[PDB]
């Protein structure tokens, strides 16, 4: 029947722990965790954030310049947590030659929606969150994506 | 004729936006063809056949004429609905492409309009240079005729004059080519264009690059097209995966048939089994079909569709990176343009001061006419450079507006307030 | 080797025109495949089938072997004729493309031939520059050794000498690359080429742009291709609209069948209904089919074809505008080149006068060898610039002739009268 | 961050290589879909039909429900095997394309990495020029204040200062755009890179062009792609010729049927000819088909395939010629780069000597601070030019390695030994 | 059933009177009028000339420079009127996003023919003539199209 | 039925004698001649060199610089003659618009293969061999193709 040999070899070097897998699966788990609790803390979200978002957010918290952004909602286009979330589907990922998978997650507050966008990267053998593109009208603060918002 | 009327005329008659509009209209019209198989299909067909027997059926001949009317309709077939959705998404992306074409038409007409003013300024500077060089050559010839310099100086002066004549010819042809480009874009000849006004022109710092990126993330056309393409790839995945499902069709038919037998053995003792028949059938039925294992087929197609989806996602990421880089580059470009405008203004002021010094010296009696002619030439060169820099700044503002995907004639209206004085664009008029 | 022989060799061995010719031949051969459905079709097919009864037909088995020779032929089907016409028009547009490729080959070989002479002249100038700069450096070293200048002057002179050495290496590599490009475009190595003749070269005024436009309107290849494409689009409209018409075929078939029965039920009192049959049928018949409402289908196809025709018309208009602009620009280029030729000729005369001045001063005793060497360098630079301008004028004539779509080897033959003397192209031979 | 880590990060995350890998994987997966028709195909299908008689069959109604399981398998049809081979060859050429994409990614990341360093050097030189020009302007202002020059000199100095400020802004924006391009390539921000080492950098003579050509003949990627394309064209000829051969299929089916009759004529004295039947069959059959003359069709297709093969051969020849020309040009490029390096080194030495002379004069008392500032500016310009030449030489070595189709990270490892000293890239940090 | 929405909105600003419509129809009626009355006057042809060929022809007549061109024939490649004309067909124009439609008009004099070409433009709500490009051997006079012949 | 018209007119100017025709046929005949007579002399191969390989080889022999290249083997990647040769298949050639047809020949010594490649051109009315490019590991000597090896 034959198979396809992956083009890449390693596609790895992961340090922190992560959820089992599945891009849409991991995104749905992240957005379920963010609503199950109402703290929106950074240290308990490490399995989802990949390797650079975690250190960048830690340094942003230690910088004492983005306090207002880090308090309300750094991971969403609205200052308040949403009532429900629905991540766009992606019917599996063959082999391991796949990074930078953007997904348009549809959020719903009280009779409102913003339809934000997030990124999936492999970085090892799991799937992890990146960027978050703030794809809703009347965005929270700063600019564009989270990385552009907090980078120097 | 200012920029606004030029843009309106160009939008009216431009044989490059009409082509894209027609292509978009065809893409939108293809939706009906895509939805056609869902609708009931009915037809009429007749035939006539004469058969002659052989071997055991020796001497048996038949003549059968049939005429049927058929009507078929699919009750449940997900593939047609998937194709309809795919056609809708393709029409949407084509519309996005048409919007991009409108934006690039606006940009092109603005650039082609400013090129003519730049050419006019260059031609005026070249005319001043020609006058100065001719006066210098005449002075050298007079000096030689009286006898003060060798013949080599006269030859060098004549060479410089010929070079200046060639430069003037080149500038005239450049102005002609600019006017011809404007005619090609707009399909009309413009013998008079509104020029820049220095009193009403001012430079304003743009908004911070953060706001520009924030707007361009959710407003750029390329990003929207890439996102729509990724959605289309996902729908293609689903359509390819829909091959496992079964299919159901409903069929109706009304047919008549007339059959006659003859030849030899028919005219025998058969009695009723060999007789002419006038048959009529009103058939109605269903048809269910469930595909089963067909080698790879559907599974391989699903894997191919998934790989295509991965590729589309990579394209979307690349488009986002390119958009960010373009926005940053445009912001820095406009900042550099302002910084250059200031320097060119100062250079113009210095050249004017030098010319005033030269003229005062000539009036008092310490200088010749050639010196003030060269001073005027330098001043004209500085003026042309400053005007070109101003036009570049305006074009950079338009480029920044376009990078966000929010370019329309309202920005041309804002630009139009700086164009007041009209100037003729005939090369003979501006420089006989 | 002059331009005529170079082009004659290039036309033969060039793997860019051969591919276009093969594509043209394939497009022309497609006419037979397009006409094939119209011609009668026939075939032979045999089969053998064993059937075992079940349920009510328990213990009944059959074995039937059939062999049928069939011959089908259409009578009235406009779609095939429309497809044939479409294929013919596609072959025509492909032929137009091949003609365009021939013109581009002529232009490319002319440009690549003149680049070699330009590089030869550049290297010849650089050699003299190197000699003069080396003599200057030796003079500076002598002055330092006797003691008249500081060490900084010696360092600067050595730096300039190293710079001119690097420039010489660059010019040598440029000549090598030009020769390699000529070899790539002709598939042969040319160690000696014909150069320009000073006396035989004369510049003539071009004909008025009105005549140029008149000829290019009806003889340009791009305009003809666009017009043929519009005609093909109209034929596509008609072919798509021809879906309403009915169709009619006739079939003939000669079939031989051999059937045998077995099983417990057959081996009984059936008598006549269960026997081996040796059947033969010479079936001949007709068939008529008139499709009726099929959803959108044909109507949407007609609308899409009309939109495609509108787009093709827009393309034709754009092509006409581009052709007009190209003709105007190519006409202005010739006059610009004439003015440049005059200016460079005067500059050459002035440089020669300066060189004669330096030589006379050196012979009298008021000058050094360095001065006459620098004068020679300047004269060589002027000569190289003039020669390059002449080559540009010769190329511009071919560009004018190609804008009208009337380029052929007769123009090269006419141009060949200006190439008289042979010059080697070995970098060591021209400048050791 | 030296070159190796940057390249590893770029290879990890780059949305231009991932799309190529996805396309390669899809092309390799298409083999299964191409081979699937060879494998057995089985399905299940049921239907139910109610028929009402008319005319002679008045008062006759039937209801028949059928269900059949079918399994078909092709015994001998080499067209499918030829299609499988064609798919395999297409996968191979796609893999070759992926290798080319890897090579161009390596080239792009190296080019961007060196561009950033060039921008850093340019910015440093520009700020040195800014310091010198500001000191000159202050000197002129002081001279005017005590009174030694006219106002025109002050205006000219201010114009020079403003021009220098604009140039500094432009250089800063250039550095920012270079960093942005590096981020676009690698998807990361580097505030720290590795600079060139002057002691560890040495220029080595390249191998003879003969060895380069010998390696590039059998190792270049484009030549392999063209050869594979020609092989695919030959396989296409064979596939087109395959149409003459006959075909053979084997079919099996298990079917059940249930038929009932009703109506006025049914309720009669038919007895055994009008009854409900519960019928069942287990059919097994063989089918053979031999197409005969079909107009041109297959013959025209064979001619078309042969013409396509001729075109592919022309493409192969053109690719070989282009490869040879490219290798020769790259060899000459590196040979010229060596001489450029030597010349710029000598220029730097001369500039340093001039600066030392100016500094000694200033210390003794014969010079002012402006003179040594201008000397430092000239020295910085020479240093920047030499560094840019060194980076160009390294990139030319990479191009030499890439033209032979043997580029990989082992060459970046060799280049990494010359990058030792870290350097910041923030415009304010390196240029306050 | 759905319908297409035209991309453009105005495609208008027509001043002078004009005939009903139809590109091929209007181009055929123009030649029918020209053969019917052998005068070939520009004052009664205004409904066919678009908006700029009319003023261009009026100013050319008043310029007293193009007498020979305006006398024999300005609308054809031959100095004399044709015997018969046949306009290349165009099977209707959907919606209103269509201008600059060129038609190859086949003229036939006494056992001859030169196959000129004309332009159809909308300019409002009907179809009007333009350009005429002298697409035949032995062109009447001047150059190329009529507009290039009479422009300055 | 129609017949294609060849694009080119002459495609000729052949001087020396030549074999009947057929690209694969001519290459196979050349290799059979090479295997049969173990001399590998240039003058007996003249009906196979085109018009320039003959003079290039003659001048190379008379130049007294390429003796070692000529003695071992000029027409293959190995210094010794092969045991068997198999020339690639080209299924005829329509009309006369076909030159520069390279074929990958497969030559077999004792359990070895090198797969050289030869150019073929028309140059008149027959088919002739040119270039030869040494497409095998452990190349005999010089560089690349034979023409590149003996050119000055």
PDB file of C-alpha atoms in Angstrom, chain C residues 299-377:
ATOM      1  CA  UNK C 299     -28.329  28.949 -19.520  1.00  0.00           C
ATOM      2  CA  UNK C 300     -25.627  29.472 -16.892  1.00  0.00           C
ATOM      3  CA  UNK C 301     -23.027  28.188 -19.358  1.00  0.00           C
ATOM      4  CA  UNK C 302     -24.207  30.730 -21.943  1.00  0.00           C
ATOM      5  CA  UNK C 303     -24.019  33.532 -19.376  1.00  0.00           C
ATOM      6  CA  UNK C 304     -20.503  32.463 -18.364  1.00  0.00           C
ATOM      7  CA  UNK C 305     -19.408  32.330 -22.007  1.00  0.00           C
ATOM      8  CA  UNK C 306     -20.806  35.825 -22.589  1.00  0.00           C
ATOM      9  CA  UNK C 307     -18.874  37.127 -19.579  1.00  0.00           C
ATOM     10  CA  UNK C 308     -15.731  35.449 -20.929  1.00  0.00           C
ATOM     11  CA  UNK C 309     -16.300  37.172 -24.282  1.00  0.00           C
ATOM     12  CA  UNK C 310     -16.631  40.526 -22.509  1.00  0.00           C
ATOM     13  CA  UNK C 311     -13.328  39.852 -20.765  1.00  0.00           C
ATOM     14  CA  UNK C 312     -11.685  38.950 -24.074  1.00  0.00           C
ATOM     15  CA  UNK C 313     -12.887  42.232 -25.585  1.00  0.00           C
ATOM     16  CA  UNK C 314     -11.394  44.118 -22.636  1.00  0.00           C
ATOM     17  CA  UNK C 315      -8.122  42.267 -23.231  1.00  0.00           C
ATOM     18  CA  UNK C 316      -8.182  43.293 -26.900  1.00  0.00           C
ATOM     19  CA  UNK C 317      -8.689  46.957 -25.988  1.00  0.00           C
ATOM     20  CA  UNK C 318      -5.844  46.811 -23.459  1.00  0.00           C
ATOM     21  CA  UNK C 319      -3.574  45.215 -26.065  1.00  0.00           C
ATOM     22  CA  UNK C 320      -4.352  47.982 -28.556  1.00  0.00           C
ATOM     23  CA  UNK C 321      -3.567  50.700 -26.007  1.00  0.00           C
ATOM     24  CA  UNK C 322      -0.298  49.005 -25.032  1.00  0.00           C
ATOM     25  CA  UNK C 323       0.691  48.650 -28.698  1.00  0.00           C
ATOM     26  CA  UNK C 324       0.081  52.356 -29.336  1.00  0.00           C
ATOM     27  CA  UNK C 325       2.127  53.375 -26.296  1.00  0.00           C
ATOM     28  CA  UNK C 326       4.969  51.029 -27.274  1.00  0.00           C
ATOM     29  CA  UNK C 327       5.076  52.430 -30.814  1.00  0.00           C
ATOM     30  CA  UNK C 328       5.207  56.013 -29.531  1.00  0.00           C
ATOM     31  CA  UNK C 329       7.988  55.266 -27.037  1.00  0.00           C
ATOM     32  CA  UNK C 330      10.047  53.349 -29.598  1.00  0.00           C
ATOM     33  CA  UNK C 331       9.684  56.242 -32.038  1.00  0.00           C
ATOM     34  CA  UNK C 332      10.927  58.777 -29.481  1.00  0.00           C
ATOM     35  CA  UNK C 333      13.877  56.548 -28.540  1.00  0.00           C
ATOM     36  CA  UNK C 334      15.372  56.848 -32.037  1.00  0.00           C
ATOM     37  CA  UNK C 335      15.473  60.655 -31.915  1.00  0.00           C
ATOM     38  CA  UNK C 336      16.989  60.523 -28.435  1.00  0.00           C
ATOM     39  CA  UNK C 337      19.668  58.187 -29.800  1.00  0.00           C
ATOM     40  CA  UNK C 338      20.426  60.520 -32.726  1.00  0.00           C
ATOM     41  CA  UNK C 339      20.969  63.429 -30.342  1.00  0.00           C
ATOM     42  CA  UNK C 340      23.178  61.260 -28.123  1.00  0.00           C
ATOM     43  CA  UNK C 341      25.224  60.204 -31.167  1.00  0.00           C
ATOM     44  CA  UNK C 342      25.864  63.825 -32.126  1.00  0.00           C
ATOM     45  CA  UNK C 343      26.852  64.758 -28.567  1.00  0.00           C
ATOM     46  CA  UNK C 344      29.266  61.834 -28.222  1.00  0.00           C
ATOM     47  CA  UNK C 345      30.849  62.569 -31.607  1.00  0.00           C
ATOM     48  CA  UNK C 346      31.531  66.153 -30.529  1.00  0.00           C
ATOM     49  CA  UNK C 347      32.953  64.906 -27.222  1.00  0.00           C
ATOM     50  CA  UNK C 348      35.286  62.566 -29.130  1.00  0.00           C
ATOM     51  CA  UNK C 349      36.483  65.478 -31.272  1.00  0.00           C
ATOM     52  CA  UNK C 350      37.193  67.566 -28.163  1.00  0.00           C
ATOM     53  CA  UNK C 351      39.089  64.700 -26.520  1.00  0.00           C
ATOM     54  CA  UNK C 352      41.209  64.257 -29.651  1.00  0.00           C
ATOM     55  CA  UNK C 353      42.027  67.974 -29.627  1.00  0.00           C
ATOM     56  CA  UNK C 354      43.090  67.752 -25.975  1.00  0.00           C
ATOM     57  CA  UNK C 355      45.281  64.722 -26.705  1.00  0.00           C
ATOM     58  CA  UNK C 356      46.954  66.568 -29.581  1.00  0.00           C
ATOM     59  CA  UNK C 357      47.569  69.499 -27.231  1.00  0.00           C
ATOM     60  CA  UNK C 358      49.225  67.223 -24.678  1.00  0.00           C
ATOM     61  CA  UNK C 359      51.367  65.549 -27.348  1.00  0.00           C
ATOM     62  CA  UNK C 360      52.516  68.886 -28.778  1.00  0.00           C
ATOM     63  CA  UNK C 361      53.381  70.156 -25.305  1.00  0.00           C
ATOM     64  CA  UNK C 362      55.299  66.967 -24.527  1.00  0.00           C
ATOM     65  CA  UNK C 363      57.283  67.177 -27.770  1.00  0.00           C
ATOM     66  CA  UNK C 364      58.066  70.865 -27.198  1.00  0.00           C
ATOM     67  CA  UNK C 365      59.134  70.182 -23.617  1.00  0.00           C
ATOM     68  CA  UNK C 366      56.390  71.621 -21.405  1.00  0.00           C
ATOM     69  CA  UNK C 367      54.711  68.310 -20.492  1.00  0.00           C
ATOM     70  CA  UNK C 368      55.435  64.852 -19.095  1.00  0.00           C
ATOM     71  CA  UNK C 369      54.501  61.393 -20.347  1.00  0.00           C
ATOM     72  CA  UNK C 370      51.842  61.070 -17.626  1.00  0.00           C
ATOM     73  CA  UNK C 371      49.840  63.930 -19.149  1.00  0.00           C
ATOM     74  CA  UNK C 372      49.698  62.361 -22.610  1.00  0.00           C
ATOM     75  CA  UNK C 373      48.836  58.988 -21.059  1.00  0.00           C
ATOM     76  CA  UNK C 374      45.887  60.547 -19.210  1.00  0.00           C
ATOM     77  CA  UNK C 375      44.798  62.279 -22.420  1.00  0.00           C
ATOM     78  CA  UNK C 376      44.898  58.914 -24.203  1.00  0.00           C
ATOM     79  CA  UNK C 377      42.783  57.387 -21.425  1.00  0.00           C
TER      80      UNK C 377
END
